[PDB]
Design a binder for this molecule. Structure first.
Ligand SMILES: NC(=O)c1ccc[n+]([C@@H]2O[C@H](COP(=O)([O-])OP(=O)(O)OC[C@H]3O[C@@H](n4cnc5c(N)ncnc54)[C@H](O)[C@@H]3O)[C@@H](O)[C@H]2O)c1
Ligand SMILES: NC(=O)c1ccc[n+]([C@@H]2O[C@H](COP(=O)([O-])OP(=O)(O)OC[C@H]3O[C@@H](n4cnc5c(N)ncnc54)[C@H](O)[C@@H]3O)[C@@H](O)[C@H]2O)c1
Ligand SMILES: C[C@@H](CCC(=O)O)C(=O)O
Ligand SMILES: C[C@@H](CCC(=O)O)C(=O)O
Ligand SMILES: [Mg+2]
Lengths: 290, 291
């Protein structure tokens, strides 16, 4: 039982914080959107007037914020407010470059810091089945584990600061490429006269099998739980995939890496996001049918 | 069951030796003497022309390099075959070619399947090939006792051409995944994320696929992957390039939109100009050619 400041109580933060309260932690919340703050208070978060106040008497500070810029600003606002050697955990999804900058800033203030971005979305968040991909020192992670367990299905140490962000962004780039490639196969099958069911049974039993087909099948019928069967309601929204791909492209640009299919997929998803940011990212299949 | 086996090359030779090993009478033809004589050494009765091999056959299997050769083989032998001979084409050819040769054979009162295969020479030798089959279910049922001794898996895909379509769609995806995995490993390295950590994450997350869990293109995480043995195939760039050409023919013939598969095909056509003999996962080292 530790005291945790939780900054950012939106679609991910609210359920995350609720599980922390359920596990017996004292949770001190801040979010400048009062609706978010109010919903969090209903589940037992003690809500404060400012982020400096929420942080003041905390052993651990979790951030679950929309961008690198917001995390940077938040750190600048609160780090001096925190007690020395408080443990900061950023579970936001932000660029590797931003992650390393904020990490260095936290340490220069005498604070411990990890990046621990997550996968699982809101459903995973509410069920406490999120995967945390953690960058930082192993000993810091050991100190953090009791805080992360109540929110987590999996905790994976990926390397030094920034490696949680790196591993996530690498996986999600691959996933985007796979989701388009699956969609392309299914439309080509359709034009060849190969049924959706038959293609599904082949690919899933063969070398092409992957989550994008076996769980996220972009045509209705073979996997009745996939978004194609429910008007492409997310699931994992195109807006979010497009955000993660922007971060992957930031990583490519910062490294001079060559990612021809990854950047092609980023370009496809940025166009699809303009009009279909609200549909599950499997809905990119629409762009392949005339 | 007497079986005429036309095409006794890298795949045909071991497949035909498995048929002999299962008690079939196997008659053979290949215009390369070394292929033929090698096949005669494991029990195939080799003939001087394909029409000769076919004469006494209940089943005719073709394992040939292109659709045009399969088509010409068919028009050379169909009049030599007995009625209701079962023709199985296990070549990898276009869906269009598959369907035309199927119509040709059935017009002569024959029964015909397309049954291309996955698994390479190793799989052919070990009798673990995956047959992806198009045609009538009642014809596949008749074919089953022949396919079985060559096969680890037999999948009915649909009507004629569905075998070719299924295999070409899966291999297009495979190509895309192998490049995507390679991109991710290079990007991880530049970010200071170790190959082992990326491997541990992706294989336990949504990006997992055979391209990483079995064909990992960096040495270490999967000690048997080609990356740990100078990228010895495995599955050659030559062959992957061939399959992607067929995917591209199918995309062109249908007016399909396949941007990443088409991109993949370009990358592999280019890589095959230099590294045809390497495992297709070696594409990880040609990414800066496209820089
Ligand atoms: N929603 C998902 O499905 C999902 C899944 C995995 C990861 N993520 C990542 O999680 C992060 C947050 O996601 P979300 O869906 O909860 O976003 P959200 O926009 O729903 O919530 C973010 C919250 O942060 C608050 N906030 C902004 N500035 C603040 C500050 N200085 N102090 C305190 N709070 C502040 C906002 O008012 C808002 O309520 C993002 O980085 C996102 O990419 C989201
Ligand atoms: N080698 C592989 O790994 C592999 C794996 C799966 C599928 N395939 C497919 O199998 C087919 C052939 O495979 P392969 O590896 O045996 O190629 P191969 O080129 O080694 O064998 C083809 C053989 O057919 C002979 N031939 C040419 N015309 C002929 C005719 N009219 N009648 C009889 N024989 C003739 C050639 O002399 C040659 O020996 C191709 O369509 C290929 O894509 C190959
Ligand atoms: C994920 C965590 C267990 C906690 C949970 O199941 O919520 C762990 O053991 O790593
Ligand atoms: C078990 C297998 C039959 C092939 C064989 O017997 O080798 C299958 O049914 O696919
Ligand atoms: Mg075709």
């Amino acid at each position: 039982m530790t005291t945790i400041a939780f900054l950012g109580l939106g679609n991910m933060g609210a359920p995350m914080s609720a599980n922390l309260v359920g596990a017996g932690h004292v949770v001190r919340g801040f979010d400048p959107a009062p609706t978010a703050a109010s919903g969090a208070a209903a589940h037992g978060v003690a809500v404060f007037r400012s982020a400096p106040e929420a942080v003041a008497e905390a052993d651990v500070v979790i951030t679950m914020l929309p961008t690198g810029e917001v995390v940077r600003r938040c750190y600048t606002d609160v780090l001096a407010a925190a007690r020395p050697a408080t443990l900061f955990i950023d579970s936001s999804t932000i660029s590797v470059t931003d992650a390393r900058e904020v990490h260095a800033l936290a340490e220069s203030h005498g604070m411990l810091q990890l990046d621990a971005p997550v996968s699982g979305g809101v459903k995973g968040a509410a069920a406490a089945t999120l995967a945390f991909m953690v960058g930082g020192d192993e000993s810091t992670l050991r100190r953090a584990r009791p805080v992360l367990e109540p929110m987590a299905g999996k905790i994976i140490h990926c390397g030094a600061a920034g490696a949680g962000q790196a591993a996530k962004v690498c996986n999600n780039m691959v996933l985007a490429v796979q989701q388009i490639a699956i969609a392309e196969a299914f439309v080509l099958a359709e034009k060849l006269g190969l049924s959706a069911q038959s293609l599904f049974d082949v690919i899933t039993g063969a070398t092409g099998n992957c989550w994008a087909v076996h769980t996220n099948c972009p045509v209705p019928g073979p996997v009745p739980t996939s978004p194609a069967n429910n008007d492409f309601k997310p699931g994992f929204s195109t807006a979010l995939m497009n955000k993660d791909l922007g971060l992957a492209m930031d990583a490519v640009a910062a490294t001079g890496a060559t990612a021809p299919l990854g950047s092609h997929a980023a370009d496809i998803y940025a166009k699809f996001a303009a009009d279909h940011a609200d549909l599950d990212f499997s809905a990119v299949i629409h762009t392949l049918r005339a």
